[PDB]
Swiss-Prot record:
Sequence similarity: Belongs to the universal ribosomal protein uL2 family.
One annotated GO molecular function: structural constituent of ribosome
Organism: Haloarcula marismortui (strain ATCC 43049 / DSM 3752 / JCM 8966 / VKM B-1809) (Halobacterium marismortui)
Name of encoding gene: rpl2
InterPro entries the record matches: NA-bd_OB-fold (IPR012340), Rib_uL2_dom2 (IPR014722), Ribosomal_uL2 (IPR002171), Ribosomal_uL2_arc_euk (IPR023672), Ribosomal_uL2_C (IPR022669), Ribosomal_uL2_CS (IPR022671), Ribosomal_uL2_dom3 (IPR014726), Ribosomal_uL2_RNA-bd_dom (IPR022666)
Key words of the record: Ribonucleoprotein, Ribosomal protein, RNA-binding, rRNA-binding
Note: This protein can be partially incorporated into E.coli polysomes in vivo, indicating it can replace the endogenous protein.
Subunit relationships: Part of the 50S ribosomal subunit. Forms a bridge to the 30S subunit in the 70S ribosome. Interacts weakly with protein L37Ae.
This protein's name: Large ribosomal subunit protein uL2
HAMAP family attached to this UniProt entry: Ribosomal_uL2_A
BP GO annotations: cytoplasmic translation
Gene Ontology CC: cytosolic large ribosomal subunit
Transmembrane segment boundaries: none
Signal peptide range in chain numbering: none
Pfam name, any one: Ribosomal_L2
Length: 237
RNA sequence: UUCAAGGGCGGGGAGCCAUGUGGACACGACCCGAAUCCGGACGAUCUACGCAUGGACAAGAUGAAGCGUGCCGAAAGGCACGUGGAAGUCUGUUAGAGUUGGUGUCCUACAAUACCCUCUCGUGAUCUAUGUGUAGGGGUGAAAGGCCCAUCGAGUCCGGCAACAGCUGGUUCCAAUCGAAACAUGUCGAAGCAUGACCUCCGCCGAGGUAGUCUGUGAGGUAGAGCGACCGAUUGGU
RNA sequence: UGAGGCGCCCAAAAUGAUCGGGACUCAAAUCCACCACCGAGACCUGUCCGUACCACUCAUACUGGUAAUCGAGUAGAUUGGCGCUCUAAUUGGAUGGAAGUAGGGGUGAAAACUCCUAUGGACCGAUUAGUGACGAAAAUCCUGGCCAUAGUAGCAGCGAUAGUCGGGUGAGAACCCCGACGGCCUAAUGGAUAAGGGUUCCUCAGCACUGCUGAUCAGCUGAGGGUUAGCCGGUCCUAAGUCAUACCGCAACUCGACUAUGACGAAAUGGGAAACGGGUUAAUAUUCCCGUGCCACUAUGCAGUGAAAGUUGACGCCCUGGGGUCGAUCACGCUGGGCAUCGCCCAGUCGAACCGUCCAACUCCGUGGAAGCCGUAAUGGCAGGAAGCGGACGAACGGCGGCAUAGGGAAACGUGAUUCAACCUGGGGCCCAUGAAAAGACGAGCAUAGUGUCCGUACCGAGAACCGACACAGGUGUCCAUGGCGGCGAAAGCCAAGGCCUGUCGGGAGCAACCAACGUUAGGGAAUUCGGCAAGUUAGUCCCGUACCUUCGGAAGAAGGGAUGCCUGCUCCGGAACGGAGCAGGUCGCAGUGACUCGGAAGCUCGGACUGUCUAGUAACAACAUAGGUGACCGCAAAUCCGCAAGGACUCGUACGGUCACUGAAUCCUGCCCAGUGCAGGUAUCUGAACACCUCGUACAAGAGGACGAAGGACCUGUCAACGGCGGGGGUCUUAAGGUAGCGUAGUACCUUGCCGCAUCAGUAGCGGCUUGCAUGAAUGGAUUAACCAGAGCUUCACUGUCCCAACGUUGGGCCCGGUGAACUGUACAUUCCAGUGCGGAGUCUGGAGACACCCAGGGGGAAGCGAAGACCCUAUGGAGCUUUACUGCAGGCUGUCGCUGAGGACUCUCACUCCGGGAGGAGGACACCGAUAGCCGGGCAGUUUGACUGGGGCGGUACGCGCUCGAAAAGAUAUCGAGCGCGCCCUAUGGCUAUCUCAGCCGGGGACCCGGCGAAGAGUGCAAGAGCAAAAGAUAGCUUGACAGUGUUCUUCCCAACGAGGAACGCUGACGCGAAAGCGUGGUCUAGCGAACCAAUUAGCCUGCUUGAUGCGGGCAAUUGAUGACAGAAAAGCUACCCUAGGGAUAACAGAGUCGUCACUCGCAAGAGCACAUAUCGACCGAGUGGCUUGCUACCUCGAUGUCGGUUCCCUCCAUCCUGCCCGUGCAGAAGCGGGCAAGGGUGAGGUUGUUCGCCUAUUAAAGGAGGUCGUGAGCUGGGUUUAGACCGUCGUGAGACAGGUCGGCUGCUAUCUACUGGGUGUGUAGGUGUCUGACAAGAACGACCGUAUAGUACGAGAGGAACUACGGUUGGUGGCCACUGGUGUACCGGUUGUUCGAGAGAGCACGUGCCGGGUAGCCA
């Protein structure tokens, strides 16, 4: 047959790429020699085309002007701080060690200095539960308990834009406009609506998948489609 | 080979080379004939989808939120009027896009997809110019196996290549002699082969042969007939 | 009363009857005899030829002889010869004329040889031996040329119908030019341009080419000429993105991703230093000239120390205010023009860049001090300080002044206003969407001077300059969107400016038929049709008014009702409009949205929620998408995906993410099943590879075995919004459950037109109810649903030429004429018709009939017409796409092991290595990554296979290897999917031998046993069938292992007649058994019970392995065992309607043909009933037939195609007669019937459901018959159904996909050569003329039928009821003709009237070939 859509994706052609040239900034925690002295002032609040969420423009003491992953509650004029000795207020960034347990956090680093990897989408947040000299236990938005180096930096507060998912798109056109700002091919044709040559579920006198939808983890690309290594399906039980 | 016996193969000197010619096998193999498969290249001037930068949409209708005023109310708010001008909203041959019916005209066309009337959309998932990206078992696809330059259930060009076929077509001067088989055995075999039958030509052998009839010595259970001769059918009566 | 001969009845078919025809009757028939003739290539006979043989011979050279016993022939075998090229030897010809060609003479059976004459003008042979790109009628053969076709089609069709009269030039003028008149184009047919073209531009000279005709013209031909830039573009910048170098990869590169660097990337249409006005050429022009202005750089000078922060460049979508120019319009004046019943109408009234100046909006400052005011179109603003007042900053392509006694104008060379494109500047709203960048500019003064190079520049820009082969009705971007009237309008219609008469052939006929577009049609009004297809109706605006339903938005312009012009005078809103809304009065028409523009409406059902997408080119839909619902995977060093690698997309992303799937808005809901399959988790035990390890083996090694055991599997569990399932039976079984809410004859229901109801005269339709559902059902989503829809079905009102039933007219063709000028097609012949025959579908054969030739027009009956090597079907050891638990492999994932890899069955560490960090350092860590290998998964991908037989193929079957009886025709052989039926073993005895013995069955005496008797065989002998057997081949007893080893002969397998395995018969050699012995035993009494090579194992001995010896382990001779049943041996599944090729009428579907079981009809006999009575009527059984309409069979004809069903239209026919005429019988009173005979003249109609044929139903009727003509009729129509590609449902399948199931959508080519006929001409024959006739023959349905009245309330009859002859009147169908009458048309004509233009008036053009409306003569018509 022919390569399935999931395979056309990997080639990285225009249709599947994100409109990167249209994006604003790569949100990452600033690098501080040490001391924490680094502070800056919020100069403006902008829309982030790559996240459909707000982002904050900050002017730092040493002249640096960078966009920041903005938590909820940050406004023009506010003074944000980044460092070990940073105050403990929303919008500030400091290592999980210096953060008091029980505080909501966002843009958490996977490993100290990577600039932030977890909890960055609209309205989400991580939960610093346990401390230690060796391990900082954080509960990610998926609900997982993650063990992180207490040296991993994070930002106090929940990400701005919460509740975005509460409103329905209502019409195809609205999805369209959002999809145009992401690295995604849309709309989506169902596999069962295709021909056998184009998809493992394609073909037939009526529409239905050929075999069962749960596919093995070991299935090769071109065949791994449907419910991937599903531990279970449906809702019952 | 073999206790043994019995079998197999060979044996009393003709070959080698040359020239012409009959035939076989490999090769293009008497000639043409088609759908393939594979390799390397050339194409996104068409078209699909994405991206960059530009452009386009008479006029009218309906009248969302918001806001105002007035009246009612303790408040909550409610009601009326106005304002406001939303919408993959309506009408619309504005421009522009599309293409339902006529199964009209055309059908050696004006045209290898045209003409006319009718019809759908026309502020949006909109239409469009130019630039730009994705390339062949690969793209692209709101998915019709659609589209990738009149080419698509795997583009185009050249090459492999004089592809192969048991299948169709064709195979060019005169005469004399003989003269079939359309059957049997085997076959992935029944549109084909091989081996026999049968046709023909050459060399050898050297006296019988037997298509006809008669007679003699033998073989035979079909026609017919019959079954108180088997067998099995098949009537009635004392 | 028996028999015979000939005939008769029985006896019906489709274009025109037949015995071949004519025609024949004491025969030209038939039967019995007879006589004479005709008549082949046979037979006889003369001569010759060939072939074979004989004599002679070297001879196959002669000569003679023989053939009664020689003379046909496809495929094929054999043999002699003719012709072509060039070579060689030998030898000739030719300018006193070679070859070739044309015509002609001679020879040879012939291939072919040769001569003569003409032409030709230089080469040409013969013999012998060679040579070979050596011989054509054919291949839908190749190339070239040519005829018919044909002076034919086209040069008409398009909403752009375009010309005409004079004149100019010229050899020549319908189309080249001038004038007038008449028209066409208005977002274009005008103006400016991008791309693209490339000289097409201008001039002169031309017409052989091109130009749909002609041409003096030209985009043609030839020759010259033409494009001028500091301030228009390029150039410069950067965009998506591209390239180059470096690095790395790769076997390698012209290959490849990342990361650096550098460069490239925008001519209309991104950003951007600077130009305006006039003038000029045949052709350029912000480029040249004149005038004026401006920018940048550099130099000089003065000023200036400032100078880089910031601003700008620089930005989305929607609504909106203000500023404001051009344009347009209004008022008034001036200048010029037009008109001439008024006094109107038209044009103009000008003047740049630039320099200077002015400034609304926004923002801000001071003052002020609002507690309710301020302000807007709207939102809004304020004690955090409103209004007012004063001030800073601050706009136009705008105002104003200069520029300008510049320029331009014949002249005047204006002033105000409104609405205001451009341009400027604000306010508001929206985003799960956030709307470039860089160069550059500003910031940052002035004088003077110098410099400003390089590339582009013509023209077209399209119904002739571009792409489409063309001067192609197609395609192709931007700007002018502000010309007038009109009106909502960038709409229509009309008209300016500007352009054009080149969407480039004309002339003629009242101009016929027929065709394309189209107008109008009385009365009826969907009767048409699959279906209202097509056409029509409605229509603009205002007022009134508006149902069910609903997601409260909508439905809605629902529906329905009314109004609408002009003129006179006014009112209101507003600053006003040349803006809008009203009032009163007058008044005309058939009609006031008067043309134009401009909805028909309502209801029920199905589907998909909606806008959107799609098969470029037959499908626009119910299919795809969608929001919404849901499940799955993943914490980012992730999940998913691309790459061989280096690397990469997702990702400037991070679970409110994004990947992978299913369902498909809302509403109410979404039951039961985990057995199978899938996925996932767990797992004592079982299974589970390689390395390392242990044992055996080998001086080593191969190899055998063990221990350990990863993933995986077994096993257990979870999971269905995972694949999917939800029955039979009874008051459980398969296999887990056993169909819940719902819905239901469904787009799913076979039976089926289900039943009931609604509706209609009538309704296979539609809707509602019922519903046992062939075979409904819950995210394979169920039900339901407002809104929406070029989606499917149905109903109503309205409408109407769809129909009854057609007519007239309009325009373009058609027809005739000038000019231009193809194609298709062609074996030949061809004036055919009716029959027959033939490979069964003939212009050509046969018999007849008809037929004088040529030509014009026509509609297409035939040439199984032309077009296409059939798409259907089968066949091929064909192809391809697709599928899967087909075969075999290959990626990829998981997992063990080895290397990298290090220190001290579980553990720590750090040093490689990996990741994070700028670094310091942090995390991880001998793991991971990578390299190698092993096991598991693995249609993700590749290559292939998937057999044959067969009354086509498939399904079924196996007649695919064997044995018997019959078929089988008394030797042998013999077919079918022929009839009956068996074998793929079983047996250590059920083998072998010997001894003893005789069986079934019946009878008699004491179904066991005992005795006797009869008893040739019916018993028994393993198993089919047939055969054999009695002191045995059977039974009993005993003994024995010959069911032995080796090797042959022969037959069979395979008749004849080659062929293996296998089988059998009969020997021998050896060894045995039994018997006194002869002898028997080569398994079972005989015919079924069977298997190659390669490989392995096994048996006994021997041969052999590369210089050699020893050991190990191999190779071989003979043979046994292991299976290929498709059985003389491949290792092997499907779909294709997305399909493709080779072929086949070797083979199916359709038509034909044969048959006639089936079907239709008839006859013989006549049981029977019919109150009695076979035969008024009905009529069984059985028997004999006819037809060729149904069905089936067959496979003859066509697969290089004979176009399907149904319908329609138009023609002919048959009779087995439905009506009509004439008759017979009656269970015939009459009337009304029933049945029958003759008979085919005429008639046999209209409708409702259905694609239907058929059939059901309704009302009429004299009756509403059946059948043939290729199931008549697609070069006639239609296209509803069957049967392409799209899709849905049900069922089946793991799946692709399928269905003798349903459903929505889904194309109709061609210019007529021949023939045929309808009509029209020209000739010839009869044999100069006029007029009038004749009539061989030919055609007709020219007439068919019904109702009514008198007869008559009569005959008949109890009555009820109720005829006839004849004479009349009328109707219907058909037929021919005609137009006084009625009616239609009537783009002759006359009137009314809307819009616009000619100034008004008058009078006119256009509005599609009449603007519309009203009337309508002639003619033509019903
Ligand atoms: Cl999303
Ligand atoms: Cl000869
Ligand atoms: Cl230019
Ligand atoms: Cl405003
Ligand atoms: K055929
Ligand atoms: Mg980032
Ligand atoms: Mg919305
Ligand atoms: Mg995208
Ligand atoms: Mg979808
Ligand atoms: Mg599909
Ligand atoms: Mg597949
Ligand atoms: Mg579905
Ligand atoms: Mg489904
Ligand atoms: Mg392009
Ligand atoms: Mg309003
Ligand atoms: Mg709309
Ligand atoms: Mg519209
Ligand atoms: Mg493009
Ligand atoms: Mg398909
Ligand atoms: Mg010959
Ligand atoms: Mg001869
Ligand atoms: Mg016999
Ligand atoms: Mg007999
Ligand atoms: Mg002969
Ligand atoms: Mg010689
Ligand atoms: Mg031939
Ligand atoms: Mg002709
Ligand atoms: Mg005209
Ligand atoms: Mg010219
Ligand atoms: Mg000239
Ligand atoms: Mg550049
Ligand atoms: Mg520009
Ligand atoms: Mg010019
Ligand atoms: Mg020019
Ligand atoms: Mg033209
Ligand atoms: Mg009428
Ligand atoms: Mg009807
Ligand atoms: Mg009808
Ligand atoms: Mg219609
Ligand atoms: Mg007023
Ligand atoms: Mg009208
Ligand atoms: Mg239905
Ligand atoms: Mg839809
Ligand atoms: Mg199409
Ligand atoms: Mg459509
Ligand atoms: Mg279509
Ligand atoms: Mg759908
Ligand atoms: Mg969804
Ligand atoms: Mg979803
Ligand atoms: Mg019903
Ligand atoms: Mg369910
Ligand atoms: Mg064919
Ligand atoms: Mg087929
Ligand atoms: Mg294949
Ligand atoms: Mg790194
Ligand atoms: Mg495959
Ligand atoms: Mg192959
Ligand atoms: Mg077969
Ligand atoms: Mg015999
Ligand atoms: Mg025997
Ligand atoms: Mg083998
Ligand atoms: Mg063995
Ligand atoms: Mg065989
Ligand atoms: Mg055999
Ligand atoms: Mg074919
Ligand atoms: Mg045949
Ligand atoms: Mg035909
Ligand atoms: Mg009769
Ligand atoms: Mg008749
Ligand atoms: Mg027919
Ligand atoms: Mg007929
Ligand atoms: Mg026909
Ligand atoms: Mg046709
Ligand atoms: Mg035709
Ligand atoms: Mg149809
Ligand atoms: Mg239909
Ligand atoms: Mg249909
Ligand atoms: Mg004559
Ligand atoms: Mg007119
Ligand atoms: Na499927
Ligand atoms: Na192939
Ligand atoms: Na392109
Ligand atoms: Na309101
Ligand atoms: Na159309
Ligand atoms: Na390909
Ligand atoms: Na080739
Ligand atoms: Na082949
Ligand atoms: Na044969
Ligand atoms: Na055969
Ligand atoms: Na064959
Ligand atoms: Na003899
Ligand atoms: Na006989
Ligand atoms: Na022959
Ligand atoms: Na002309
Ligand atoms: Na106007
Ligand atoms: Na729309
Ligand atoms: Na299960
Ligand atoms: Na399961
Ligand atoms: Na079901
Ligand atoms: Na639509
Ligand atoms: Na008409
Ligand atoms: Na014809
Ligand atoms: Na294919
Ligand atoms: Na096979
Ligand atoms: Na044998
Ligand atoms: Na018959
Ligand atoms: Na044919
Ligand atoms: Na028909
Ligand atoms: Na008749
Ligand atoms: Na009917
Ligand atoms: Na036919
Ligand atoms: Na047709
Ligand atoms: Na038809």
């Amino acid at each position: 047959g022919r390569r399935i859509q999931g395979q056309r994706r990997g080639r990285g052609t225009s249709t599947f790429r994100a409109p990167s040239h249209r994006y604003k900034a790569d949100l990452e925690h600033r690098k501080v020699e040490d001391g924490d002295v680094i502070a800056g002032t919020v100069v403006d609040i902008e829309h982030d085309p790559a996240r459909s969420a707000p982002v904050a423009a900050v002017e730092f003491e040493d002249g640096d002007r960078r966009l920041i992953l903005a938590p909820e509650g940050v406004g023009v004029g506010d003074e944000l701080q980044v460092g070990v000795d940073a105050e403990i207020a929303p919008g500030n960034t400091l290592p999980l060690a210096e953060i008091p347990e029980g505080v909501p956090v966002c843009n958490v680093e996977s490993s100290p200095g990577d600039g932030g990897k977890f909890a960055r989408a609209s309205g989400v947040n991580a939960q610093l539960l346990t401390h230690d000299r060796n391990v900082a236990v954080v509960k990610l938005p998926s609900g997982e308990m993650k063990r992180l180096d207490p040296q991993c930096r994070a930002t106090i507060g929940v990400v701005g834009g919460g509740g975005r998912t509460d409103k329905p798109f209502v019409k195809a056109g609205n999805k369209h406009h959002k999809m145009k700002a992401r690295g995604t091919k849309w709309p989506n044709v169902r596999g069962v609506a295709m021909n056998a040559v184009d998809h493992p579920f394609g073909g037939g006198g009526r529409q239905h998948p050929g075999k069962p939808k749960s596919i093995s983890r070991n299935a090769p690309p071109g065949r791994k489609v449907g419910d991937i290594a599903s531990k279970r399906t449906g809702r019952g039980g």
